[PDB]
From a paper:
The lasso peptide MS-271 is a ribosomally synthesized and post-translationally modified peptide (RiPP) consisting of 21 amino acids with D-tryptophan at the C-terminus, and is derived from the precursor peptide MslA. MslH, encoded in the MS-271 biosynthetic gene cluster (msl), catalyzes the epimerization at the Cα center of the MslA C-terminal Trp21, leading to epi-MslA. Herein, based on X-ray crystallographic studies in association with MslA core peptide analogues, we show that MslH is a metallo-dependent peptide epimerase with a calcineurin-like fold. The crystal structure analysis, followed by site-directed mutagenesis, docking simulation, and ICP-MS studies demonstrate that MslH employs acid/base chemistry to facilitate the reversible epimerization of the C-terminal Trp21 of MslA, by utilizing two pairs of His/Asp catalytic residues that are electrostatically tethered to a six-coordination motif with a Ca(II) ion via water molecules.
Hence, recombinant N-terminally His6-tagged MslAΔTrp21, which lacked the C-terminal Trp21, and MslA Trp21G variants, with an achiral glycine instead of Trp21, were prepared by co-expression with MslB1 in E. coli. As a result, the X-ray crystal structures of the MslH:MslAΔTrp21 and MslH:MslA Trp21G complexes at 2.29 Å and 2.12 Å resolutions, respectively, with one monomer in the asymmetric unit, which are the same as the MslH:apo structure, were successfully obtained. The electron density of MslAΔTrp21 in the MslH:MslAΔTrp21 crystal structure allowed us to locate a cyclic peptide molecule (cMslA Gly12-Phe20), consisting of the Gly12-Phe20 part on the C-terminal side of MslAΔTrp21 with a disulfide bond between Cys13 and Cys19, in the large cleft conformed by two monomers. However, no electron density corresponding to either the MslA leader peptide or MslB1 was identified in the MslH:MslAΔTrp21 crystal structure. The cMslA Gly12-Phe20 of MslAΔTrp21 molecule is accommodated in the cleft with various interactions, such as a σ–π interaction between Phe228 of monomer A and Tyr15 in cMslA Gly12-Phe20 (3.8 Å), hydrophobic interactions between α6’ of monomer B and MslA Ala16-Val18, and polar interactions between Gly60 (3.4 Å)/His295 (2.7 Å) in MslH and the carboxyl group of the C-terminal MslA Phe20 of MslAΔTrp21. In addition, an architecture that would construct a six-coordination motif, consisting of four amino acid residues Glu44, Asn87, His259, and His261 and two water molecules (w1 and w2), was detected around the C-terminal carboxyl group of MslA Phe20 in the MslH:MslAΔTrp21 crystal structure. In the six-coordination, the w2 water molecule hydrogen-bonds with the side-chain of Asp11 and is further held in the structure by the steric contraction of the His295 side-chain, which forms a hydrogen-bond with Asp11. The in vitro enzymatic reaction indicated that the catalytic activity was maintained in MslH expressed in M9 medium, as in the case of the recombinant MslH expressed in Luria-Bertani (LB) medium.
Numbering used by the authors:
A (entry chain A), C (entry chain A), E (entry chain A): 1 to 208, 211 to 439
B (entry chain B), D (entry chain B), F (entry chain B), G (entry chain B): 12 to 20
């Protein structure tokens, strides 16, 4: 009956024009994206005509702001539905995110994940085509506290911001380790400095056999360990909107931004896996993840795919022309710096950060085919971002050649093996997931 | 932004 | 030659009209304030006509927003120079603080501590009278990270915000306590989750014999202890502007907001004392502190007074008509709440928070007399905020009657005794500091 | 806002 | 690997529509410009919808202001990157140059050389195409003092303006000539009128064996002579941005406006040659000059071309419809003048200024080919501007016919001979530089 | 702003 | 704009 194709991708950190080069492998990527019914990416950059003020985002790597003309590069390349909840959408504050919504709506680009209040950030966006409709929901587990949007009260408006997926981490420690922690709390004088809060609240907010010291949760356990768990409010609220989107579109896609690592850098946080299973339990047809800037595994759960990380589809951080004063201060200089010189110094003249490692310059574009909601095909198109090229050329995407596509498909297979995922490989280096249907 | 005092009401 | 009088006060948390009642003791307070050359207070509330969006400030006790008409109550009561750097000036975000600056300038009220960028927040404001001039600088050590203002770069504007006095706390632990902390770091799996940051930065950001675990600084020492120290950039920058103000006014007053407690709730943070000494070293004639909502000691340093905390001069938190949705969520309710009901539930129907304790409803208004920069008199006027009165009446200030003024003057003397400060007491309950001049 | 990973560049 | 073509041209003084006529030689010029990857010209006219006020620019020949619709003529003709730093961009003041930036950005035209502050005027603009990117920097050595842009201070904004290349001229005189100059200074009473400045500054600002009289620098030398030298700040600052542009684009082009003559009208100023060598030393791939309204020589320096002057690509000064009152005053008239009559009288009914001489109506459009930054071809296309035609038709460009193209190519060869430049000549009158690669 | 050339038309 | 006086502070 209804047959729809969806292209997925990761972080779109675009800061310059000419996104699709004259390379035939790059033009074939645009042809691939244009040929689908819907093409989703995560706008990991603030398009701006000047509205707002830079926030201090040292932990996110600095501000990521670009001329709003980059939005024409995104649409001309083939992307048609935008997820905006990430740790950079608020780089220009509440006024910046209101400016982003204005820019996207004036260009007729559907988006989700940000809004003038919390409900607007949580809502799905519905993209309608002659062949059918797709609902996109977008959330992020990585952001500066306070950047989440807020809903209005009877007396005050809401707050523009992002759709949050909060989570808590608990340290499991032995009883003897717990006793030393409380000993350190008492003997340093730290417990004495909570005496006022004890009188005002009536309780010591550090005794919960839980315990909250140094802004971290500790719990007595038989063996040391580390746990993560999604905020119940965010999980139930996002799931609520997923069930709503299921009634009003053929396909529901949940895009989640998450930098958080599991026990290993390539594994997702345990909470993120619980989140993705819940989204499919509620009716989502796919979960697309991003954040780490490298690829993570792919899981098939109840015959629906979870892409824990598609990495970067566009990577032009080092080419941004808008560096904030607080960002400049992170580099000690004997003379005022130009942006390119600042990024060269920040990376130690290229010897650290993302440039030296190949994992940050390989990507993947899945193309999913659905027939009345059933996944019938999941093609995998490896993407090359130009590792080792000059800074002004690396970061633009093109379909990887045969040899490098095969290495990328091998990585994906190895990263997805713990989930029982198998891949068929074509002669050109592209592949597809082995499905049970 | 209220590290060791916890409460700054 | 030049003789000037300065009235000082603490937190002005005004949310209603009729600030000065028909009580003769309240009208005499207005007469006292009006009779000085300059009257300084800390505007601990966002006056607003609607511009901005509420930020999440749970740690500050919620949002503190009021009708801008309260500014007429502040000036009619006698206050004439306003310090605005505190942990509530950003309760409506960057747009709110820009709206506050607009409101203050349209009413011709001199202010300092906030600005459209960092320099503007650091600048002194110069209040000129026929008898002479006073320079006010205002900073805060308590605020949500990111709320500090930012200066512009060649490519991006600054960020509106407050004048910050940042500080770091270090836990001194024994070597055996340090070994258990690193053991907990390794055995829980926490050290494993920094593996990516180790590759990107080239170092483990937790090994500094310093150490940074759980967002807290640890140092090996012979005995456990607790240290605090001002951020060197903020200390040098604020001191720089103090020396500038010294050249352009008779009197330089530094107002610093600080909730941070010392070893005991009544003692200031060690960093705050270093800050106050530095301000007078640089040429300030007085340092007025606030934040804790109760009184702290008074110190005479190089014949200049340091008031570590003057408490509240106006306390009408529970009467605010603008409660944000995130604030409402902190109280579990079976029905939507009105503001007054919300505050009643938040305080456990009056059995906790500030209402049960008398220290939160006594205040002090010092009146300093300077002659060519030399302190010649420091009168102390105890102020009563109506402990035990109904919520709609407590928080308005009046000169305390004889009996309660004497008890307040005794508290101040006891809180100032560790600094060697002596007080003379008048028959009406007012007093003055014993000076060496 | 990047508690245990420290870096989320 | 990367192969890019760049068309260069001189002053674009366009004031009317129909820039490209139905002449096949003019349509072939548009085809040539459209066929390159980038086409650069110097916008020597203020496009305006009415914003700003005319400045007094008698020395520049009057105001040069046109309907903003001429920008559509510029882009339709094939020009795609605009250099704006010249001695007419400020003809409508700071408000006019802000209006020009608005007009160019609303039409999506990349530009450089002007900005809201000095940094913005110094920045390169990056033009991205599928085949690669070009960085354009634009400066001017000819402008009214004060028209240069200014950067902001902590308390005041910058000033919109142009990117300056300042320079100083020193007169070398014999010791006996120097003694007469100081004698004239003393005996006329001129030295007496600096008595106040001597007391205020503590020195006589005329004794530097340097010497500054009559707003001119004099130096004792063995033989009389004339020297020029670039301002060290401007040279180092422009070079700094050139090195920045080198990191972020394949090709860096520096466009410099300079009317200043050398010992002969056809030779460039000595400072301009030092500037051009420095630009290529810093990494620029080409230096395009303009200003004099006639052609100057071409130099190959380290295998990169320097075009000291490409003259006019469009010359419609006498057709402007917007003549200022101060401009009108330069022509004594017994009745109020219409623009065309004013220009006829100003040129003495065509017997002086630019119309009588053929050098002001020949031009050149170089087309450079680069392969991975190496110059592989430099084609030369002579352009005819219609010498001797009626005023309403001369000034529109077309590819010169064979006979006149040959004469223009001969001029270029003779003007470039002192630099050792050789030219190959085709049968149609076009040519190309002899390269060492 | 046209010191020795005098004319920069 | 301060030809022979040089300084017009
Ligand atoms: Ca991210
Ligand atoms: Ca406070
Ligand atoms: Ca010119």
């Amino acid at each position: 009956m209804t047959r729809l194709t969806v292209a997925l991708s990761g972080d779109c950190m675009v800061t310059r024009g000419g996104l699709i080069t004259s390379d035939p492998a790059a033009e074939r990527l645009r042809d691939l994206l244009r040929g689908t019914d819907f093409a989703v990416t995560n706008l990991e950059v603030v398009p701006s005509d000047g509205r707002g003020h830079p926030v201090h985002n040292a932990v996110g790597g600095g501000c990521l702001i670009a001329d709003s003309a980059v939005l024409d590069e995104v649409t001309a390349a083939g992307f048609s539905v935008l997820g905006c909840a990430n740790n950079h959408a608020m780089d220009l504050g509440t006024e910046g995110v209101l400016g982003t919504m204005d820019l996207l709506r004036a260009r007729g680009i559907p988006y989700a994940g940000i809004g003038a209040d919390l409900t607007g950030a949580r809502r799905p966006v519905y993209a309608d085509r002659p062949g059918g409709s797709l609902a996109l929901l977008s959330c992020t587990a990585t952001f500066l506290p306070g950047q989440e949007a807020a809903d209005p009260s009877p007396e005050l408006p809401g707050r523009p911001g992002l759709n949050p997926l909060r989570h808590t981490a608990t340290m499991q420690v032995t009883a003897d380790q717990m006793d030393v922690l409380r000993t350190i709390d008492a003997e340093t004088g730290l417990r004495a400095r909570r005496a006022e809060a004890r009188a005002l609240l009536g309780v010591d907010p550090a005794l919960l056999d839980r315990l909250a010291l140094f802004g971290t949760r500790f719990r007595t356990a038989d063996a040391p360990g580390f746990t993560t768990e999604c905020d119940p409010r965010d999980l139930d609220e996002i799931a609520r909107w997923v069930g709503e989107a299921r009634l009003r579109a053929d396909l529901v896609v949940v895009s989640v931004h998450s930098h958080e690592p599991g026990p290993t850098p390539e594994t997702p946080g345990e909470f993120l896996r619980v989140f993705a299973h819940r989204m499919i339990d509620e009716g989502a047809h796919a979960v697309v993840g991003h954040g780490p800037h490298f690829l993570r595994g792919v899981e098939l759960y109840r015959n629906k795919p979870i892409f824990y990380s598609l990495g970067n589809i566009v990577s032009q951080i080092e080419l941004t022309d808008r560096v904030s004063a607080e960002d400049y201060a992170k580099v000690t200089a004997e003379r005022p710096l130009t942006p390119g010189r600042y990024y060269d110094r920040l990376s130690g003249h290229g010897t650290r950060l993302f440039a030296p490692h190949r994992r940050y310059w390989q990507s993947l574009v899945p193309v999913l085919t659905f027939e009345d909601g059933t996944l019938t095909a999941a093609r995998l198109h490896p993407v090359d971002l130009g590792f080792g090229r000059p800074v002004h050329r690396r970061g633009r995407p093109r379909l990887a050649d045969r040899a490098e596509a095969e290495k990328t498909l091998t990585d994906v297979a190895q990263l997805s093996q713990p989930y029982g995922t198998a891949i068929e490989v074509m002669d050109d280096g592209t592949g597809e997931l082995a499905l049970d249907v | 932004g209220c590290g060791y005092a916890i409460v700054c009401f």
